[PDB]
Amino acid sequence: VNPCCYYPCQHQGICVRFGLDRYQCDCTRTGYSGPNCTIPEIWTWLRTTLRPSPSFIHFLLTHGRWLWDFVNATFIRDTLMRLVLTVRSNLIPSPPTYNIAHDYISWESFSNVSYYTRILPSVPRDCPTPMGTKGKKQLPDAEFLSRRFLLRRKFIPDPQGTNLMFAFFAQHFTHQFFKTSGKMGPGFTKALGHGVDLGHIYGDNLERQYQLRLFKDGKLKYQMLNGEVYPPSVEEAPVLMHYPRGIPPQSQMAVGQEVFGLLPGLMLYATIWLREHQRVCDLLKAEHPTWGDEQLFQTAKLILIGETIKIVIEEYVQQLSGYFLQLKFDPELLFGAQFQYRNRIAMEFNQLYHWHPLMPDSFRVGPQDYSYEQFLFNTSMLVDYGVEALVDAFSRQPAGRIGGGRNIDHHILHVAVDVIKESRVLRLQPFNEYRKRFGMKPYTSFQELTGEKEMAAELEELYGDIDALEFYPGLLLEKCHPNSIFGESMIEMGAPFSLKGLLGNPICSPEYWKASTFGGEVGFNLVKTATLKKLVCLNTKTCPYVSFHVPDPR
Amino acid sequence: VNPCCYYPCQHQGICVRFGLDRYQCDCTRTGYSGPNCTIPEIWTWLRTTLRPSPSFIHFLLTHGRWLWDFVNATFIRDTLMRLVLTVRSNLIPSPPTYNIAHDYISWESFSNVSYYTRILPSVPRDCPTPMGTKGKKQLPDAEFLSRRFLLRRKFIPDPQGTNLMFAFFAQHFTHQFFKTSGKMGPGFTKALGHGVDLGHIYGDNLERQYQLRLFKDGKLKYQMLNGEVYPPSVEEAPVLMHYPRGIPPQSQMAVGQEVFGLLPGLMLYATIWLREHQRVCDLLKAEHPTWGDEQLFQTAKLILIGETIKIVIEEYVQQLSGYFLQLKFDPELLFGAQFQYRNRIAMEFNQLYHWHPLMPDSFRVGPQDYSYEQFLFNTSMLVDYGVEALVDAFSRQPAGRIGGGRNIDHHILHVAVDVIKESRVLRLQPFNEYRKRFGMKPYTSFQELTGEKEMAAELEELYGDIDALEFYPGLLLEKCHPNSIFGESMIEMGAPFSLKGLLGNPICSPEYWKASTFGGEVGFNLVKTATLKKLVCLNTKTCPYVSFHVPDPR
Numbered sequence A, B: 001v002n003p004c005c006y007y008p009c010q011h012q013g014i015c016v017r018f019g020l021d022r023y024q025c026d027c028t029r030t031g032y033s034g035p036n037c038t039i040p041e042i043w044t045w046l047r048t049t050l051r052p053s054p055s056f057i058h059f060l061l062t063h064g065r066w067l068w069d070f071v072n073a074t075f076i077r078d079t080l081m082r083l084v085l086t087v088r089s090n091l092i093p094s095p096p097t098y099n100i101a102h103d104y105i106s107w108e109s110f111s112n113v114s115y116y117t118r119i120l121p122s123v124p125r126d127c128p129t130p131m132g133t134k135g136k137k138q139l140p141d142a143e144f145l146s147r148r149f150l151l152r153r154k155f156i157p158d159p160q161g162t163n164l165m166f167a168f169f170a171q172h173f174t175h176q177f178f179k180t181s182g183k184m185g186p187g188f189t190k191a192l193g194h195g196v197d198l199g200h201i202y203g204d205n206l207e208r209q210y211q212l213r214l215f216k217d218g219k220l221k222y223q224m225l226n227g228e229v230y231p232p233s234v235e236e237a238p239v240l241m242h243y244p245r246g247i248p249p250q251s252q253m254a255v256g257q258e259v260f261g262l263l264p265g266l267m268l269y270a271t272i273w274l275r276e277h278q279r280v281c282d283l284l285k286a287e288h289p290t291w292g293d294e295q296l297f298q299t300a301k302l303i304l305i306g307e308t309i310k311i312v313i314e315e316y317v318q319q320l321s322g323y324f325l326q327l328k329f330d331p332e333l334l335f336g337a338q339f340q341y342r343n344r345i346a347m348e349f350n351q352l353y354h355w356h357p358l359m360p361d362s363f364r365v366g367p368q369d370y371s372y373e374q375f376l377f378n379t380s381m382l383v384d385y386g387v388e389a390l391v392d393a394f395s396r397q398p399a400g401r402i403g404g405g406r407n408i409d410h411h412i413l414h415v416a417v418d419v420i421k422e423s424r425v426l427r428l429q430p431f432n433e434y435r436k437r438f439g440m441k442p443y444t445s446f447q448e449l450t451g452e453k454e455m456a457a458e459l460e461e462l463y464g465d466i467d468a469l470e471f472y473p474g475l476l477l478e479k480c481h482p483n484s485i486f487g488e489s490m491i492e493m494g495a496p497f498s499l500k501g502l503l504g505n506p507i508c509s510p511e512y513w514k515a516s517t518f519g520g521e522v523g524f525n526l527v528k529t530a531t532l533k534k535l536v537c538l539n540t541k542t543c544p545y546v547s548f549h550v551p552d553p554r
């Protein structure tokens, strides 16, 4: 009973439940027609039938680097880059649609921005299985799936050669828009602003942003330890910070994102970006002696946002895609498109970025391995080695494979367990529903999913139906592409959430991406040539190896 | 000293002050080039030179109704309507640009949404005149300009034949997005949501919205006086309401916008829309017996927003434009355009909608005139005459001319005085700067402005330079078009602020304007055929004369 439990409306048509026993699919401009939105318009049809396999497109982006050096040297770089942007971005709705409270559009869902859109509604709470129709009557014990399948047995490094500089960049970056409320529950972001507002550096709330500001030359407060510039102490900026009970204000560093006390990893980066902010303030001060503090501050936040979003497209995403296409951040590729410039980070996007397999077994800085119980919460390590050293270290140690399964180190394995349970509170739909939704074809067996027989078989025994595989488990347990860090679904589902958040940033709008926004060519060129090496090395007394890539191929 | 005081950058290029003594104009994609953004690209040029006079275009929209009956019967209705939408909407920046605190783009200006964008920055606080360069060293005494020029001498009715149903619709409507904070100051809207969020019916803050809700069938609370449905008392919904000290809870009606106790006018309408909400709830309940309260509520807010925004385009704006073009609200005209769906109501747009000249000398309901001291705060009048009667009355009494000057009745003349003083705190730029900005040509004399010699001459004596006429005074004192309620500037500056707020509503987005949003065809057709007569008459026991127009031409 309840027709919408059968997920009847295909090609993202919407199932509105009508009088009691019946329902209706709204196929408004889905490209399909008829009662379950399934008969293709001739165009719709032709497009889909000619669309090449995802797994195949991947290989073309990792086919002969010669041809791609040539394509990268022509304007086709720009064409394909525009096209990646448009095509991938169209899959994410704008304005936002639903949230935990509403599986319909409402104005509230549209304005209460403490919320996280979901792109697919809840499994209706009146369905037979907790997953709709198919599946076991009661889901697998989370604790169990994680120990049995997610847990690191033997460390598998990522084949693409990702290092911890990347692992930690990703952590830092992600934690400016993923900040689940806790005190309100799942759904609910405390990181309102919903994207690359650099609130991990400056604060999710103004009051804290003023607490971290110097209010001189547009600068941010800091402290000076040994030779260098390190974040101020909670002594000099009250701000808050989560630190294990019994750690003292003085020894705590005040940062922006309250969690970053947790590891050096997080702290390292927040130091680089504070140093970078100061630097930019001074160039801007030099340029405009009139400016005054507030304008220097705000213009600096804009440059650094421009920097962050360039480094992410041209270096971070270029590292984990592994495409030979040279990606580029040129906002102007979208000025001819019908693109909306706004973003709402989705709860599903939060599940998908739960990629803790990157974290290794121990942390080798210098020639000494550190345990997690030495690394996590170590307050001195940063100050002791200094930004230069740690960058080099993290740049050399490899990060783990994400996809494939059996790779979450036990110290953090509990997190993946909480993720699966949140999928459950969240009532996230099946995996495959999301597969369909992101333009992919559903798995017919776990054997197709995994790509082996042993796990697949037990997984089958547990879930009961491939059509009942939970979203996060399936994401992590799917077969990796060739010799890649994850497989098909991570890229096809993750990529649109990521490119809309990046290019849907107001800065990229024709209205804002003008040189004056940044304070004239000076500022504007700083965002236009930002580079990870430049970020680290211009703020360090000596340049280490800095890369998202593990060296030389060693 | 301070180059930007001379307003150097033409065609809305932006004057960034550089090292001390010098500055630079950023002409990024203005269509013009060179140091003050003045040399036209050949396209830019050709367009502008071929653009017909505004005053002329107006006459074409009030040229032979025969030709316009034919154009209205073809698809050209839709073409011109699309074109009005695109063309007018392009003049308003999206995302928002500045605010009182920032005359540069900043992320804060972009996210602290208690703010009101201004489309042109402040007169820099270091300029010689308070208006930049030109003008008297100290501005005209507000008190004086208003008594001398704004004040109603003899009532001039509006020639277009606008009535008080319109006067009060406009008041009600406007007060859902103009809610200056007071406790924070000028700048600062308490009506966050910035547009047609129907927060005048439902509340600017959720907590109050829950206080006004019944939480049964999606309905809103109410009370039953004599035969009809009237808003609940502050007794039954705490909510707040501004009522003159000493009025008791029971006699106060609880509404949504706290000010609406002030007049029957405001209350009358809030009664119609509460009755309309309930009605819609029931149709929706009838359609979907499954639905439950929250979804009925939210789907009703969406229908009523759709209604409000139709009635405004096809009836309200059609009444005060007086064009023979039949305007239409069809969101689909913009699905091919590059339109951004977001709005931020501007402080200037608040000044311009300060059009208090509509209010008459006394209020004749029935055959008895009421004084302002009988009308304002009269708690019984609504209940005493009932919605039916008052609609008829207000539908017959004519509203005053807006433009032209000398028409603000003394009882409310003080308001216009506060407006001019807020223009001053706000440091709003000259009038003409805004003229240029909205694609018009500046006045060379007050004589050109006004269109007579006596006021113009004294005005000149007071302001010192035509290029120093304050924005609101100039708006109200400019010569009315032919036999129209206001003149050129009110339409050319007001119209874009208005059409972006209307069509930049999320509901109009391709993502939302689907039948399901509204709950299937039923709901969707209610927004698609909404009419003022339907609004009033389907919620009243007997249909009066209902119009924005004064009858028959009498």
Ligand code: HEM
Residues within 6 Å of the ligand: A167, A168, A170, A171, A174, A178, A179, A180, A181, A262, A263, A350, A353, A354, A355, A356, A357, A358, A359, A376, A412, A415, A418, A419
């Ligand atoms: C490889 C880098 C990492 C990435 C990309 C990553 C990503 C994430 C993300 C996206 C969240 C969700 C945040 C929210 O919405 O509130 C999260 C939560 C969490 N992560 Fe990580 N993380 C990483 C490394 C770590 C490490 C090293 C630890 C170990 C200290 C860790 C422990 C946790 C915990 C405890 C939570 C919050 C509690 C919970 O979800 O139940 N993460 N992580």
Ligand code: HEM
Residues within 6 Å of the ligand: B167, B168, B170, B171, B174, B178, B179, B180, B181, B262, B263, B350, B353, B354, B355, B356, B357, B358, B359, B376, B412, B415, B418, B419
């Ligand atoms: C013809 C209909 C009217 C329109 C279109 C109109 C419009 C406005 C607007 C746009 C505001 C600004 C609201 C804000 O930002 O806070 C306002 C303020 C005000 N109006 Fe009206 N109004 C109308 C009739 C009236 C009447 C009849 C009165 C007399 C009781 C009145 C008295 C005021 C007062 C006292 C203020 C607030 C104080 C101030 O601005 O100093 N208005 N009006």
